[PDB]
Design a protein around this ligand. Structure first.
Ligand SMILES: NS(=O)(=O)c1nnc(NC(=O)C2CCCCC2)s1
Ligand SMILES: [Zn+2]
Length: 257
Protein backbone atom coordinates (compact mmCIF):
# COMPACT_ATOMS: atom_id res chain seq x y z
CA UNK A 1 0.00 0.00 0.00
CA UNK A 2 1.14 3.53 -0.78
CA UNK A 3 2.93 5.67 1.75
CA UNK A 4 6.03 7.80 2.24
CA UNK A 5 8.74 5.17 2.76
CA UNK A 6 11.59 4.17 0.48
CA UNK A 7 9.58 1.33 -1.07
CA UNK A 8 6.09 2.84 -1.24
CA UNK A 9 6.71 6.60 -1.44
CA UNK A 10 5.75 9.20 -4.04
CA UNK A 11 8.05 7.82 -6.73
CA UNK A 12 6.11 4.54 -6.59
CA UNK A 13 2.57 5.89 -6.61
CA UNK A 14 2.25 5.96 -10.40
CA UNK A 15 2.24 2.17 -10.49
CA UNK A 16 -1.15 1.99 -8.79
CA UNK A 17 -2.30 5.53 -9.65
CA UNK A 18 -1.13 6.33 -13.20
CA UNK A 19 -2.62 9.82 -12.92
CA UNK A 20 0.44 10.52 -10.75
CA UNK A 21 2.11 11.45 -14.06
CA UNK A 22 -0.89 13.49 -15.18
CA UNK A 23 -1.27 16.96 -16.59
CA UNK A 24 -2.45 18.78 -13.45
CA UNK A 25 -0.67 17.14 -10.53
CA UNK A 26 0.01 18.74 -7.17
CA UNK A 27 1.88 20.06 -5.36
CA UNK A 28 3.99 22.38 -7.48
CA UNK A 29 6.72 24.89 -6.96
CA UNK A 30 5.30 28.40 -6.91
CA UNK A 31 7.76 30.53 -8.84
CA UNK A 32 6.77 33.91 -7.42
CA UNK A 33 8.27 35.91 -10.26
CA UNK A 34 6.41 33.88 -12.91
CA UNK A 35 3.04 33.85 -11.13
CA UNK A 36 0.94 36.61 -12.64
CA UNK A 37 -1.24 38.98 -10.69
CA UNK A 38 -4.83 38.52 -11.83
CA UNK A 39 -6.78 41.67 -10.89
CA UNK A 40 -10.01 39.82 -11.73
CA UNK A 41 -9.45 37.44 -8.81
CA UNK A 42 -11.83 38.23 -5.98
CA UNK A 43 -10.85 38.27 -2.31
CA UNK A 44 -11.20 34.90 -0.65
CA UNK A 45 -14.31 34.51 1.50
CA UNK A 46 -13.54 32.20 4.42
CA UNK A 47 -16.73 31.72 6.45
CA UNK A 48 -15.78 29.45 9.33
CA UNK A 49 -17.80 31.06 12.15
CA UNK A 50 -20.34 28.18 12.20
CA UNK A 51 -17.82 25.37 11.70
CA UNK A 52 -18.61 22.12 13.54
CA UNK A 53 -15.55 19.98 14.09
CA UNK A 54 -16.37 16.46 15.12
CA UNK A 55 -13.40 14.16 15.30
CA UNK A 56 -9.69 13.81 14.74
CA UNK A 57 -8.39 10.68 13.03
CA UNK A 58 -4.92 9.25 12.45
CA UNK A 59 -5.43 7.64 9.05
CA UNK A 60 -1.90 6.26 8.76
CA UNK A 61 -0.72 9.08 6.47
CA UNK A 62 -1.62 12.21 8.45
CA UNK A 63 -4.26 13.21 10.95
CA UNK A 64 -7.57 14.65 9.78
CA UNK A 65 -9.71 17.03 11.79
CA UNK A 66 -13.14 16.29 10.38
CA UNK A 67 -16.12 18.60 10.18
CA UNK A 68 -19.85 18.26 9.81
CA UNK A 69 -20.30 19.00 6.11
CA UNK A 70 -24.01 18.13 5.94
CA UNK A 71 -24.92 21.85 5.88
CA UNK A 72 -23.27 25.09 4.75
CA UNK A 73 -21.63 25.77 8.11
CA UNK A 74 -17.97 26.37 7.21
CA UNK A 75 -17.57 27.43 3.59
CA UNK A 76 -14.99 28.82 1.22
CA UNK A 77 -16.18 31.13 -1.56
CA UNK A 78 -14.86 33.88 -3.76
CA UNK A 79 -11.29 34.03 -4.95
CA UNK A 80 -11.03 31.91 -8.09
CA UNK A 81 -14.04 29.84 -7.07
CA UNK A 82 -17.48 29.67 -8.60
CA UNK A 83 -20.06 28.69 -6.03
CA UNK A 84 -19.75 27.39 -2.51
CA UNK A 85 -17.27 24.87 -1.14
CA UNK A 86 -17.89 23.19 2.21
CA UNK A 87 -15.10 22.42 4.63
CA UNK A 88 -14.89 18.67 5.18
CA UNK A 89 -11.54 18.26 6.95
CA UNK A 90 -8.11 19.70 7.48
CA UNK A 91 -4.78 17.96 7.90
CA UNK A 92 -1.09 18.75 7.66
CA UNK A 93 2.00 17.50 5.91
CA UNK A 94 5.28 17.92 7.76
CA UNK A 95 8.93 16.99 7.82
CA UNK A 96 11.40 15.18 10.00
CA UNK A 97 13.39 18.45 10.12
CA UNK A 98 12.30 22.07 10.05
CA UNK A 99 13.85 22.55 6.58
CA UNK A 100 11.31 20.32 4.85
CA UNK A 101 7.73 19.21 5.16
CA UNK A 102 5.64 21.40 2.90
CA UNK A 103 4.24 20.06 -0.34
CA UNK A 104 4.08 23.31 -2.25
CA UNK A 105 7.30 25.25 -2.35
CA UNK A 106 7.84 28.95 -2.96
CA UNK A 107 10.79 29.70 -5.21
CA UNK A 108 11.96 26.20 -4.24
CA UNK A 109 11.76 27.02 -0.52
CA UNK A 110 10.30 24.22 1.59
CA UNK A 111 8.43 25.16 4.73
CA UNK A 112 8.37 23.04 7.88
CA UNK A 113 4.79 21.97 7.24
CA UNK A 114 1.69 22.73 5.23
CA UNK A 115 -1.92 22.83 6.36
CA UNK A 116 -4.61 21.77 3.91
CA UNK A 117 -8.21 22.81 4.55
CA UNK A 118 -10.21 20.64 2.19
CA UNK A 119 -13.53 21.83 0.78
CA UNK A 120 -15.92 20.31 -1.72
CA UNK A 121 -18.14 22.04 -4.24
CA UNK A 122 -21.70 21.83 -2.99
CA UNK A 123 -23.05 21.66 -6.54
CA UNK A 124 -21.91 18.02 -6.58
CA UNK A 125 -23.80 16.97 -3.46
CA UNK A 126 -21.11 14.89 -1.71
CA UNK A 127 -17.32 14.74 -1.55
CA UNK A 128 -17.25 11.42 -3.38
CA UNK A 129 -19.01 12.91 -6.39
CA UNK A 130 -17.02 16.14 -6.17
CA UNK A 131 -13.66 14.39 -6.51
CA UNK A 132 -14.78 13.11 -9.91
CA UNK A 133 -15.09 16.67 -11.19
CA UNK A 134 -12.39 19.09 -12.37
CA UNK A 135 -13.79 21.79 -10.09
CA UNK A 136 -14.88 19.45 -7.33
CA UNK A 137 -12.56 20.55 -4.52
CA UNK A 138 -10.92 23.68 -3.25
CA UNK A 139 -7.97 23.11 -0.94
CA UNK A 140 -6.74 26.09 1.04
CA UNK A 141 -3.04 25.56 1.66
CA UNK A 142 -1.22 27.36 4.44
CA UNK A 143 2.50 27.11 5.08
CA UNK A 144 3.92 26.57 8.57
CA UNK A 145 7.27 27.95 9.66
CA UNK A 146 8.87 27.27 13.02
CA UNK A 147 9.06 30.26 15.34
CA UNK A 148 6.46 31.52 17.78
CA UNK A 149 3.69 29.15 18.81
CA UNK A 150 0.33 29.26 17.08
CA UNK A 151 -2.13 29.40 20.00
CA UNK A 152 -5.01 28.17 17.84
CA UNK A 153 -3.04 25.03 17.00
CA UNK A 154 -2.45 23.91 20.58
CA UNK A 155 -5.77 22.12 21.00
CA UNK A 156 -4.82 19.99 18.00
CA UNK A 157 -1.32 19.36 19.34
CA UNK A 158 -2.62 18.27 22.73
CA UNK A 159 -5.00 15.61 21.40
CA UNK A 160 -2.33 13.89 19.28
CA UNK A 161 -1.25 11.66 22.17
CA UNK A 162 -4.70 10.07 21.97
CA UNK A 163 -4.38 9.25 18.26
CA UNK A 164 -0.77 8.12 18.12
CA UNK A 165 -1.34 5.23 15.74
CA UNK A 166 -3.13 4.52 12.49
CA UNK A 167 -6.87 4.05 12.87
CA UNK A 168 -7.18 5.82 16.20
CA UNK A 169 -9.71 8.62 16.43
CA UNK A 170 -10.85 10.95 19.18
CA UNK A 171 -13.79 13.25 19.67
CA UNK A 172 -12.69 16.71 18.62
CA UNK A 173 -15.63 19.08 18.86
CA UNK A 174 -15.75 22.88 19.00
CA UNK A 175 -12.41 23.43 17.30
CA UNK A 176 -12.32 26.77 15.52
CA UNK A 177 -10.20 26.57 12.34
CA UNK A 178 -10.10 30.36 12.15
CA UNK A 179 -7.30 30.04 14.71
CA UNK A 180 -5.08 28.43 12.07
CA UNK A 181 -5.26 31.26 9.54
CA UNK A 182 -2.60 33.91 9.01
CA UNK A 183 -3.47 37.60 8.97
CA UNK A 184 -3.49 38.04 5.19
CA UNK A 185 -5.60 36.07 2.73
CA UNK A 186 -3.37 36.96 -0.24
CA UNK A 187 -2.98 33.80 -2.27
CA UNK A 188 -1.73 32.00 -5.34
CA UNK A 189 -4.09 29.71 -7.19
CA UNK A 190 -3.79 27.05 -9.85
CA UNK A 191 -5.66 23.92 -10.96
CA UNK A 192 -4.25 20.71 -9.55
CA UNK A 193 -4.87 17.47 -7.80
CA UNK A 194 -5.06 15.64 -4.55
CA UNK A 195 -1.50 15.24 -3.33
CA UNK A 196 -2.18 11.75 -2.05
CA UNK A 197 -3.61 8.76 -3.89
CA UNK A 198 -5.91 8.62 -5.71
CA UNK A 199 -4.27 11.87 -6.93
CA UNK A 200 -7.47 12.94 -8.64
CA UNK A 201 -7.27 16.10 -10.73
CA UNK A 202 -10.20 17.76 -9.04
CA UNK A 203 -8.64 20.55 -6.93
CA UNK A 204 -8.58 24.29 -7.25
CA UNK A 205 -5.54 25.04 -5.11
CA UNK A 206 -5.51 28.27 -3.13
CA UNK A 207 -2.16 28.67 -1.38
CA UNK A 208 -1.82 31.56 1.03
CA UNK A 209 1.27 33.70 0.70
CA UNK A 210 1.62 34.34 4.43
CA UNK A 211 2.82 31.35 6.48
CA UNK A 212 1.67 30.83 10.02
CA UNK A 213 4.27 30.40 12.72
CA UNK A 214 4.19 27.37 14.99
CA UNK A 215 6.60 26.55 17.74
CA UNK A 216 9.29 23.90 17.66
CA UNK A 217 7.40 22.13 20.46
CA UNK A 218 4.19 22.08 18.40
CA UNK A 219 5.83 20.56 15.33
CA UNK A 220 7.78 18.14 17.52
CA UNK A 221 4.45 16.75 18.67
CA UNK A 222 3.39 16.17 15.06
CA UNK A 223 6.58 14.14 14.64
CA UNK A 224 5.69 11.84 17.55
CA UNK A 225 2.72 10.43 15.68
CA UNK A 226 3.01 7.00 14.08
CA UNK A 227 2.27 5.81 10.56
CA UNK A 228 1.79 2.29 11.92
CA UNK A 229 -1.10 0.83 13.84
CA UNK A 230 -0.96 -0.02 17.52
CA UNK A 231 1.08 -3.13 18.18
CA UNK A 232 3.10 -2.75 14.97
CA UNK A 233 6.72 -1.64 14.58
CA UNK A 234 6.91 2.06 15.30
CA UNK A 235 7.52 4.27 12.28
CA UNK A 236 7.35 7.95 13.08
CA UNK A 237 4.86 9.90 11.01
CA UNK A 238 7.29 12.36 9.44
CA UNK A 239 7.98 13.48 5.88
CA UNK A 240 4.42 12.74 4.78
CA UNK A 241 4.72 15.20 1.90
CA UNK A 242 4.72 14.70 -1.85
CA UNK A 243 7.41 16.72 -3.66
CA UNK A 244 6.69 19.32 -6.30
CA UNK A 245 5.37 17.95 -9.58
CA UNK A 246 5.80 19.35 -13.10
CA UNK A 247 3.74 22.46 -13.73
CA UNK A 248 3.11 21.41 -17.36
CA UNK A 249 0.49 23.56 -19.11
CA UNK A 250 -0.56 25.63 -16.12
CA UNK A 251 -0.25 29.21 -14.96
CA UNK A 252 -0.21 30.11 -11.30
CA UNK A 253 -2.18 33.28 -10.62
CA UNK A 254 -1.60 35.66 -7.73
CA UNK A 255 -4.33 37.60 -5.98
CA UNK A 256 -1.83 40.32 -5.06
CA UNK A 257 0.74 42.58 -6.68
N1 LIG B 1 -3.30 16.52 0.49
S1 LIG B 1 -4.77 16.97 -0.22
O1 LIG B 1 -4.61 17.27 -1.64
O2 LIG B 1 -5.41 18.10 0.45
C1 LIG B 1 -5.92 15.61 -0.08
N2 LIG B 1 -5.53 14.41 -0.64
N3 LIG B 1 -6.69 13.42 -0.36
C2 LIG B 1 -7.70 14.10 0.30
N4 LIG B 1 -8.81 13.32 0.72
C3 LIG B 1 -9.81 13.89 1.55
O3 LIG B 1 -9.76 15.02 1.83
C4 LIG B 1 -10.87 12.95 2.08
C5 LIG B 1 -10.41 11.71 2.51
C6 LIG B 1 -11.26 10.77 3.06
C7 LIG B 1 -12.60 11.10 3.21
C8 LIG B 1 -13.05 12.35 2.81
C9 LIG B 1 -12.19 13.30 2.27
S2 LIG B 1 -7.32 15.58 0.61
ZN1 LIG C 1 -2.87 17.46 2.09
Amino acid sequence: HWGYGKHNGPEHWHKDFPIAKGERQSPVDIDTHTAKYDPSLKPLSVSYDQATSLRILNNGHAFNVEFDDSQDKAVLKGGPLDGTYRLIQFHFHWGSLDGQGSEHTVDKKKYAAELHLVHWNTKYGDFGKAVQQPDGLAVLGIFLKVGSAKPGLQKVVDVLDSIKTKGKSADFTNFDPRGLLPESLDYWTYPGSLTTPPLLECVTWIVLKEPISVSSEQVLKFRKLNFNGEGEPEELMVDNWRPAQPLKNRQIKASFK
